[PDB]
Amino acid sequence: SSSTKEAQQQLEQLLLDLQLLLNGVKNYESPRMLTFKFYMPKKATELTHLQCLAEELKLLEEVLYLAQSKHLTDIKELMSNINVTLLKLKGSETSFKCEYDDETVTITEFLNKWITFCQSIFSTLT
Numbered sequence: 001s002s003s004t005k006e007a008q009q010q011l012e013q014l015l016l017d018l019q020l021l022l023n024g025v026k027n028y029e030s031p032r033m034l035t036f037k038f039y040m041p042k043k044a045t046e047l048t049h050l051q052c053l054a055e056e057l058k059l060l061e062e063v064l065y066l067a068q069s070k071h072l073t074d075i076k077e078l079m080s081n082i083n084v085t086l087l088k089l090k091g092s093e094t095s096f097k098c099e100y101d102d103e104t105v106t107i108t109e110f111l112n113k114w115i116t117f118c119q120s121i122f123s124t125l126t
Contacts, residue, residue, distance in 0.1 A: 011121065014050075015115065017078060020078060021079070022108065022115070025064070028069050030069050037104035038060075038104055039105075040056065041101070047125070050089050050118075055098060056110075065079075067107075
């Protein structure tokens with residue numbers, strides 16, 4: 001199923017991108033960012049839920065860019081690839097919904113949980 005293969009390929013790339021982004025956060029972020037806590041989605045189980053990742057990246061990428069020990073050329077290129085990949089996985093629905101947990105997360109947790117979500121979504125691409 002070649003549109004399935006294309007979606008699998010893009011999700012594999014997004015997985016590579018998120019892991020690499022996480023590696024960078026752990027190695028390169030000032031320990032000040034350790035205490036930064038924010039809200040993130042529950043329950044992401046289908047391809048259309050990746051819109052909830054794109055939605056939060058609009059401002060979180062700006063956080064990542066400023067949070068970096070000073071580099072930025074490579075983080076910008078990495079986040080650009082993430083963004084292109086999510087665009088290629090986006091459907092044509094004109095609106096979407098996200099449910100958030102009131103318990104906050106760090107950037108490191110956010111990324112580990114989204115990797116986990118993406119790996120679960122991957123097994124739905126029948």
